[PDB]
């Protein structure tokens, strides 16, 4: 129940404002900046502000804060969803999200803001559907918005019917300083770029554990996805009935399903780091990386970030494989490895100086995060079984998909 959706800037200036109900005065935006400054300076800053009887709930963008003022007991989740949809629409329409496009795309920005939400209730949020009625370079609105299928425009025709899938894995490990992993969860991400002719009804089928148990084949390798979040095109009723994933893919790249299940296996990359930091004399970084993944998979672009001292200077790196560079901007040692074959072991011996004068305040111990990305390796073991592409006209589709294994929240707690 937002009252006025406005876009701020880094200096407190409102780049663009669009009131939807008019119950909140436009002058309340000026007090948002002082309120945010006071909250940040006292540790009480939150995404949802409160200027008397008006609440300023907004998120932080790349360069401006999309604060949406409200007065009644409006749904905070609804406001956040509307802000996320607006950000996604802006990203789809404008390649950059900064002040350079706010002051240059006002003619289309105002129209998009007016069409997106009326009276504080959003009605259209699909960038592909919205691009057929609001352009910066007007016909009647498309029937897709009025029709039930609001995520697949009818009449799309292509020379070929090729759909590219992307089974991107997210290996997140929360390893404590004692050496044990506390939060070790892998979140799947099935992103597909559907490019076909017409409005095909995709019938996604994988080796799900529940599906295998229902069919009676609960004995082979099945992915045990604890949480499965289907897209808007995916029919919730069909999935709830008999695990049938039937939905119409959209035109372009979109996220169909987002699996999320816990992982009880050993980490793909094991980092054994030591800190022989002398008392204002020197420091030693005996960091050893052990690859627990399969030898057939190579972790391309392996970047194990080792947090070095903030005031360290004149550092020396004695490693074995991969270039080690210290970035003063980040205040950490970037153990960058181009190719990391499975089962490899890289040993590094850091050595940096330290000023004689002790620091005035503590700096903390940021966790060590690895950036391993091993392609063609599915940690969860989930493999796509079938993709039922059915069209009324009748055509031979050529579906494709690739499995990518990367590191998500794979941080290692320091000592």
């Amino acid at each position: 129940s937002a009252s006025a959706v406005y876009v701020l800037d880094l200096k407190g200036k409102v780049l663009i404002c669009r009131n939807y109900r008019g119950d909140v005065d436009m002058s309340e935006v000026e007090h948002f900046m002082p309120i945010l400054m006071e909250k940040e300076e006292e540790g009480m800053l939150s995404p949802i502000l409160a200027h008397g009887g008006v609440r300023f709930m907004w998120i932080k963008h790349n360069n401006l804060y999309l604060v949406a003022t409200s007065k009644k007991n409006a749904c905070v989740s609804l406001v956040f969803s509307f802000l996320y949809k607006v950000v996604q629409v802006f990203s789809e329409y404008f390649k950059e999200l900064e002040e350079e496009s706010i002051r240059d795309n006002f003619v289309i920005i105002y129209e998009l803001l007016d069409e997106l939400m009326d009276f504080g209730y959003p009605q259209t949020t699909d960038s592909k559907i919205l691009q057929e009625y609001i352009t910066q370079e007007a016909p009647r609105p498309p029937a897709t918005v009025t029709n039930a299928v609001s995520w697949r425009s009818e009449g799309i025709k292509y020379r070929k019917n090729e759909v590219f899938l992307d089974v991107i894995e997210a290996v997140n490990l929360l390893v404590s300083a004692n050496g044990n992993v506390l939060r070790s969860e892998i979140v799947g991400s099935i992103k597909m770029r559907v490019f076909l002719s017409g409005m095909p009804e995709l019938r996604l089928g994988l080796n799900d554990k529940v599906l295998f148990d229902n069919t009676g084949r609960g004995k082979s390798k099945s992915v045990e996805l604890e949480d499965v979040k289907f897209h808007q095109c995916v029919r919730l009723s069909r999935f709830e009935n008999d695990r049938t994933i039937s939905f119409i893919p959209p035109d372009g790249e979109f996220e169909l399903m987002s699996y999320r299940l816990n992982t009880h296996v050993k980490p793909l990359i094991w980092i054994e780091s030591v800190i022989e930091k002398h008392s204002h004399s020197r420091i030693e970084y005996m960091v050893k990386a052990k690859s627990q993944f399969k030898r057939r998979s190579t972790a391309n672009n392996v970047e194990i970030h080792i947090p070095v001292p903030n005031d360290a200077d004149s550092p020396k790196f004695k490693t074995t494989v991969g270039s080690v560079k210290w970035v003063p901007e980040n205040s950490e040692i970037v153990w960058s490895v181009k190719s990391f074959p499975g089962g490899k072991e890289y040993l590094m011996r850091a050595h940096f100086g330290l000023p004689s004068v002790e620091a005035e305040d503590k700096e903390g111990k940021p966790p060590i995060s690895v950036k391993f990305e091993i392609p063609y390796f599915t940690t969860s073991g989930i493999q796509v079984r079938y993709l039922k592409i059915i069209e009324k006209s009748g055509y031979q589709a050529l579906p494709w998909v690739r499995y990518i294994t990367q590191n998500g929240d794979y941080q290692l707690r320091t000592q």
């Binding site: 899938l165 019938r203 089928g205 069919t215 990305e373 063609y376 796509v384 690739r402």
Partner: peptide, 18 residues
């Protein structure tokens, strides 16, 4: 070629489940 694993063709349905 493509970084992150080469794209592989997918099936149409579970042919072994009828």
């Amino acid at each position: 070629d493509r970084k992150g694993g080469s794209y592989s063709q997918a099936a149409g349905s579970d042919s072994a489940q009828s």
